Amino acid sequence: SGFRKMAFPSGKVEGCMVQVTCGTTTLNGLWLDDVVYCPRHVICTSEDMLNPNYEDLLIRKSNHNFLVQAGNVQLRVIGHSMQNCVLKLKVDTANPKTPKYKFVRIQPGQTFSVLACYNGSPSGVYQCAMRPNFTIKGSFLNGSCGSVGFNIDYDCVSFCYMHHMELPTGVHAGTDLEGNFYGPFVDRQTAQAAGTDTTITVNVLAWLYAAVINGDRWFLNRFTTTLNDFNLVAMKYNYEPLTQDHVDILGPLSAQTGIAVLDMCASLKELLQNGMNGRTILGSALLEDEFTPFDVVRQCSGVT
Amino acid sequence: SGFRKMAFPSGKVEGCMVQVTCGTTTLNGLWLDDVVYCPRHVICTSEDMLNPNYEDLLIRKSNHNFLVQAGNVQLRVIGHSMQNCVLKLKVDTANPKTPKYKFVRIQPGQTFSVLACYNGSPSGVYQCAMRPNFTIKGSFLNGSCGSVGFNIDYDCVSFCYMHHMELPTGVHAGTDLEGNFYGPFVDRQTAQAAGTDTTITVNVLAWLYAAVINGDRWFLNRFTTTLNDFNLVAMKYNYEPLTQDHVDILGPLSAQTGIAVLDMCASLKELLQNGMNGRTILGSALLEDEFTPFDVVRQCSGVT
Ligand SMILES: *CCC(=O)N(c1ccc(C(C)C)nc1)[C@@H](C(=O)Nc1c(C)cccc1CC)c1cccnc1
Ligand SMILES: *CCC(=O)N(c1ccc(C(C)C)nc1)[C@@H](C(=O)Nc1c(C)cccc1CC)c1cccnc1
């Protein structure tokens, strides 16, 4: 028992991290097969961040201007192209450590692990979620650009995020591995405010199920509610609307605990209205929303 | 910016996880050089957990009774010995993935990463701390035994914990890699209650420093205190006593922020006395104590 914010083991991704330098800028790249993926803003200078014309900046760059280093050894760049906001640098050597992989574009509320890197070297791994406003609350310093988000299904790594920037409010924005930003963000040093960071309701309910499985049951009440009644409360507290799809996804947790989804919604409703009164759930004094129903089942069953 | 509960990248440890089976029991082992380390309770049957005599149980076991599997391949066991509560199984093949490593016995309040494994396969990585009562609040299911705790200094993994058991209260107990339990726990299915889980004061202060660096400064007050005055409040709230050694360890964070350690103690004192009034610090509604001063500096500087 016990419930932790668990990240996937990072070994398979560690074997893909490289350093990419273009002129004076150094960031992280992701080496899969004979292609190194990195944020296109690696080509930007200091007086470029304000309003960069990436196509024009890219014309002044040749294959030899992209320095790619994997460990202590240099990779030879034989081609380069820009796909949306990422650069794809073709190298002459396929990464011998390339795992089975997919590129996936995740939906808000979905979770993933991040391997934070600097100079192509991994420094840490943490679990986070794509917020409903398409930002991520990460831990990224200058040089972390190019660090990636991923999920693992047995031996297949599904890459879903590449870090590009920090917004003026300290939250993070990035792309999928096709270079498309999550949300309306642009790779430009300009005024970009994030929308309402609403709570991921289905994730909170999954975590309330995790709490019941692990013995924290004080919040369980004698009430029930309806999807419409619950949603009126959820809107009031800036919680995402709960749909019948969410109820369906929570089915296995409802079945394991014998607590119907709508009864758990009524427990959640009373926690929103009354607060926690100085009590804790799974060692937290607030309602946790960065565990999906899939994560709760996976961690509670020990999927390797 | 941003501050996350970050674990070390787990790749180096993933390459050391093996499955150990003795009779009908399967748990995790740690393969370093030509030795596989695992909890000695792998030799216990069902009617043994109550009061096992490990030396007597071990006499009935030969090298061929310990099945060690690394991936899909079997390791040949050429020797076995018991060192305290761990078994050391000598194999005929040195692990080709053995990283530079040390075995260290950590002190309470120190943090480490855990690679939770089942059947010798890694399923997740999380960061935790050795509690002042020598338990760990982990996420371990049946079969997780043998999963290990570690810290990494550039390329050297310092193994500090091996999981052995869950206490009747859902908290976890284990040994260092020499087989010595942390705390007074024994590898026996018997009444073992944990002591007071006090808060790691130096860690809370480090995390308050992390908050100030990341912009969360609302809790900073106009007060100061003394070590003795602060400690009277800390005892009242089951916080560990703060020593001059702790003040010294917080020196770099005090210097970076310009906030003297005793002023941060006075802020912490007011948070203990007044509570958070529904506010949050670094996304938490309670005072976090599983980041050491070293972790705060490392995460805030990006040590790879
Ligand atoms: C890897 C590059 C980097 O660290 N950062 C960066 C710098 C420039 C650009 C574009 C050319 C605009 N993108 C990323 C920063 C970063 O995003 N800095 C930043 C902050 C902190 C706030 C507002 C705007 C900007 C852009 C200059 C970085 C720093 C910390 C974490 N992630 C990224
Ligand atoms: C790897 C073995 C295992 O999963 N567990 C176990 C079983 C037996 C023994 C000894 C022979 C006594 N040690 C460990 C359990 C475990 O500790 N079970 C347990 C619990 C949950 C509560 C009170 C006592 C015991 C011992 C039987 C395990 C389960 C979950 C997490 N860690 C370990």
Curated annotation (Swiss-Prot), chains A, B:
Domain Peptidase C30 span(s) in chain numbering: 1-304
Segments on the Cytoplasmic face: 1-304
Result of changing residue 189 to A: Does not affect ability to cleave and inactivate human TRMT1
Location in the cell: Host cytoplasm; Host Golgi apparatus; Host nucleus
Cross-link (Glycyl lysine isopeptide (Lys-Gly) (interchain with G-Cter in ubiquitin)): 5, 90
Impact noted for substituting residue 132 to H: In strain: Omicron/BA.1, Omicron/BA.2, Omicron/BA.2.12.1, Omicron/BA.2.75, Omicron/BA.4, Omicron/BA.5, Omicron/BQ.1.1, Omicron/XBB.1.5, Omicron/EG.5.1
Catalytic activity: TSAVLQ-|-SGFRK-NH2 and SGVTFQ-|-GKFKK the two peptides corresponding to the two self-cleavage sites of the SARS 3C-like proteinase are the two most reactive peptide substrates. The enzyme exhibits a strong preference for substrates containing Gln at P1 position and Leu at P2 position
Domain of life of the native organism: Viruses
Catalytic-site annotation from UniProt: 41, 145
Regulation: Inhibited by pyridone-containing alpha-ketoamides compounds 13a and 13b. In turn, alpha-ketoamide 13b (tert-butyl (1-((S)-1-(((S)-4-(benzylamino)-3,4-dioxo-1-((S)-2-oxopyrrolidin-3-yl)butan-2-yl)amino)-3-cyclopropyl-1-oxopropan-2-yl)-2-oxo-1,2-dihydropyridin-3-yl)carbamate) inhibits SARS-CoV-2 replication in human lung cells. Inhibited ex vivo by michael acceptor inhibitor N3. Inhibited ex vivo by compound 11a and 11b.
Quaternary structure annotation from Swiss-Prot or TrEMBL: 3CL-PRO exists as monomer and homodimer. Only the homodimer shows catalytic activity. Interacts with host FBXO22; this interaction promotes the proteasomal degradation of nsp5.
Function: Cleaves the C-terminus of replicase polyprotein at 11 sites. Recognizes substrates containing the core sequence [ILMVF]-Q-|-[SGACN]. Cleaves and inactivates human TRMT1, preventing tRNA guanine(26)-dimethylation of tRNAs. May cleave human NLRP1 in lung epithelial cells, thereby activating the NLRP1 inflammasome pathway. May cleave human GSDMD, triggering alternative GSDME-mediated epithelial cell death upon activation of the NLRP1 inflammasome, which may enhance the release interleukins 1B, 6, 16 and 18. Also able to bind an ADP-ribose-1''-phosphate (ADRP).
Protein name in the entry: 3C-like proteinase nsp5
Residue span relative to the full protein: 3264 to 3567 of 7096
